[PDB]
Design a protein around this ligand. Structure first.
Ligand SMILES: Cc1ncc(COP(=O)(O)O)c(C=O)c1O
Ligand SMILES: Cc1ncc(COP(=O)(O)O)c(C=O)c1O
Ligand SMILES: *Cc1c(COP(=O)(O)O)cnc(C)c1O
Lengths: 365, 373, 365
């Protein structure tokens, strides 16, 4: 089977015993045993396991892991490290990942270095003797900066390092870090994966047998596990991923090219524009660009006004749902991040209506 | 008797007492005493196979293991800590893993070298080097290594020439007759031939080396069971005919593929255009069923393989069934992409284990897959 | 013979035939022979130049010495040993003209370089290519006085097939002897501490190794960047007070470092003699003393020029290592802030030097 069939029949997609074409929702905490010696839903749940087998299946991993949130996943990953350990980080990583390091992992003995991941020499310049991991996020939030995964994972592998890739923006449908040399892939399932702005989840998967028990252990020992209801909803959502990503990309390309040719707009940030820094690299490691774009307008004070006069676009705090979201990283989630930077999550509505909502909003500034 | 007759009557192919034209399967762990004592030390079913492989490769003794890796492990168990080994850059990921993950932790060391370049091996020899591991033709780029040359150079230093002769079987290539000290096989492949047995085979020129290997077969305990021994031996009986058919099919397929507009480069030693074709012809009496080919558009390799309906998408090789894999997404997925291209392994490289089906059915399957990209 | 004595009677310090306590100046281009079959031509050999070369060999513990038209011409000749397609490691803050030598001269001749921090011994390990032939160290470093461990870098380079090349200009043969610490080639700008009198442009190069000596000789002769007899003699003359000058330089430099450090108006101070200096314990171990070279960055960065232009004793000029005090902003003439002031502390009375600084500080905010 191919990717789009896999989205539907991949992982575990059926109930063996009943023939049920969906995985049963296992609202249980405990299972009867049949001799002294599934045991507990913190360590094992058939509904979560189905979901986990599915993400492993999509990223080409040996095991999947489902978490209460994206951050519970990322946390569980970095729990593989001891105190005195050093980690290299992208300079515009998701705000919560940086906060995690700053205020949680530091207080417990880990250190970091903020580098430019598109500058492969900067990563070389920063490897300390106690460095153990490299954390990559491409495309990036909110500038959509592209990082060469294969090359980073190469630099990383010949040093004793771990390649950890937050693959949220480009989904397993568009990018597959594990097939480029990465060791661990992390997702916020809150976003594109479930796709309906109705589930908070995290997903992690890995190439490596040993890393798999390591993650397994800390998923269960720290206990940040995803519930069966959420698991089931996320898997349900994954079934339409292919269709949703195609439409996300179609709409995003239309919006990107609308903003680029627009007088009131200065810079557009989107991986699918040929004038995007590293467009060639993007095409080589991604099979598509997603729905995420930010843009900056010439008159920088008029940002709040523009965002607030949008009717169809929803002024909200997340991304990657069927509904379009609008945001200003400065006042929400310096370094390119002018305060007049508007970040659209382009959804799956009709492109004409999405273009019309942007027209009417510019026509007010 | 000639090679073809030897596959049927060589080693021990007959039960002396009963007359049975097939060696009996001794499913026994022990023997009464008043020349066998324990089946992990010696078993008449395994012994028969052992004699056969020694007899085919012109060795003094054979040793059957639970797996190809198990045999290669027994060989490398010869060396003490401090010893250093030269490995080919296109070594079986599992052989490379043995060193990287098992033997290193035990005190060995290696250096990776292109063995098709003889001066490279010379540049790499240290005072503490004791062995040279060769594999020709290679997986997946089918790159040839001058056996006689490498054996000789290695001999005139203090080195054991260890050759993995899996791909080009004892039917087409005999390393021991070209200066090699030890030959290793994955019996799992062409030797068994029916993708139904997992086995290692190891043979040697040298009585002293044989005592060493015998000791480690026994002390480490990674031996081959009597049932599989017998199964492997049964498979070997058609090795000749199967290889003839593999090669016929493979040639035909290679020739088809280079006629082909979408296909860029084809890697097969039986092609005159293959680097070292003339060398190939010197040390091999034939070529195997093993080939790869790269297509012009990388991203089209996935679709090509997916639409195949005769070739089985699989991990192994050397069976009567044709097998297809994409080394970059299967046998080599762990390795960073830019390193894979460094080693010649593009995402568009497709490896075929050409089976023994009707060549036309094999070709019609390739045509329809191209037709769909 | 001790170093203090060796500066006066070392190499050749006497005319053998006449008994002159000074080496005569051979302003000659050619010599009569009784050939066909000592001195033939002044480019190949001159008794005055040779005297100086023998002296430096003797000072650094070399087998041969080599006098050039400048510090650069020597460094040039050293790197002239290498074929095209070879690779070399460079300190991240080697001398400004040593970079400009590689950057613009030796590269286009088929040479390749990698800028590294050499005080990070693991960084040099990370940069070794199969075609790399030599490492080039410079400690203390211009103009930050960053210290590199000569003994270890030599070792790391020695177990690979590499040549250790050290620019010993700053910590002279009187304080540091790289050749005994596993270096292969040492190079000096004679223009600096060796001449001591800011009146000679010269370069000196010496080596441990017979075969390297043959090579450097060949390239000194073939390129012909040789030092003249009068300059050699003046250089030798200068070297005779080296010990005395270095002691006064250090005594003054330590006295200034401690003034600048305890000063409210100053931010950082770079001097290997300060206890609170990166690798101070390393300095003490490989060096017998700290020289007259120090730099400092002040709190008000924009008022660096006003400071320098109001100094009355220190001379605003373009060199170092002289009996008179020199000052420069190395940026106008990676650590180097456009307000870093570099001081070449002379051998004048420390009270006069400190009173020049007091009065200069007392004119800025
Ligand atoms: C050459 N040698 C050895 C092996 C290892 O053999 P086994 O899997 O039987 O251990 C393989 C692949 O399996 C191979 O292609
Ligand atoms: C270290 N190395 C090399 C040189 C080059 O010396 P010159 O300009 O006399 O050739 C200098 C400058 O004096 C230096 O400080
Ligand atoms: C939003 C986001 C997260 C956070 O996931 P939660 O579901 O908020 O835990 C993690 N990574 C990326 C890239 C995100 O965008």
């Amino acid at each position: 089977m191919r990717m789009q069939t896999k989205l539907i029949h991949g992982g575990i997609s059926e109930d063996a015993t009943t023939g049920a074409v969906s995985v049963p929702i296992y609202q249980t905490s405990t299972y009867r045993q049949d001799a002294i010696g599934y045991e507990y839903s913190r360590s094992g749940n058939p509904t979560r396991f189905a979901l986990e087998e599915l993400i492993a299946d999509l990223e080409g991993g040996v095991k999947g892991f489902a978490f209460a949130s994206g951050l519970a996943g990322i946390h569980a990953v970095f729990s593989l490290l001891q105190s005195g350990d050093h980690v290299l980080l992208g300079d515009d990583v998701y705000g919560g990942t940086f906060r995690l390091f700053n205020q949680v992992l530091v207080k417990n003995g880990l250190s970091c270095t903020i580098i430019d991941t598109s500058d492969i020499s900067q990563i070389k310049k920063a490897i300390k003797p106690n460095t153990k991991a490299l954390y990559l996020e491409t495309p990036s939030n909110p500038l959509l900066k592209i990082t060469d995964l294969a090359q980073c994972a190469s630099v990383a592998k010949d040093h004793g390092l771990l390649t950890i890739v937050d693959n949220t923006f480009a989904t397993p449908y568009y990018q597959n870090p594990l097939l480029l040399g990465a060791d661990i892939v992390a997702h916020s399932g809150t976003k594109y994966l479930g796709g309906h702005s109705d589930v908070v989840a995290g997903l992690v998967t890995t190439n490596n047998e040993a890393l798999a028990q390591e993650i397994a252990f800390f998923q269960n020992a720290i206990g940040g596990v995803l519930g069966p209801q959420d698991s089931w909803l996320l898997q349900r959502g994954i079934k339409t991923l292919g269709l949703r990503m195609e439409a996300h990309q179609k709409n995003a390309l239309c919006v990107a090219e609308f903003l680029e040719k627009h007088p009131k707009v200065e810079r557009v940030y989107y991986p699918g524009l040929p004038t995007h820094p590293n467009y060639e690299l993007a095409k080589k490691q991604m099979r598509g660009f997603s729905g995420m774009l930010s843009f900056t307008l010439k008159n920088d004070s008029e940002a709040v006004a523009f965002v607030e006069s949008l009717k169809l676009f929803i002024l909200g705090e997340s991304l990657g749902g069927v509904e379009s979201l609008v945001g200003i990283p400065a006042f929400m989630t310096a370094a390119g991040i002018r305060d007049g930077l508007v970040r659209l999550s382009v959804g799956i509505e009709h492109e004409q209506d999405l273009l019309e909502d942007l027209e009417q909003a510019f026509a007010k500034i």
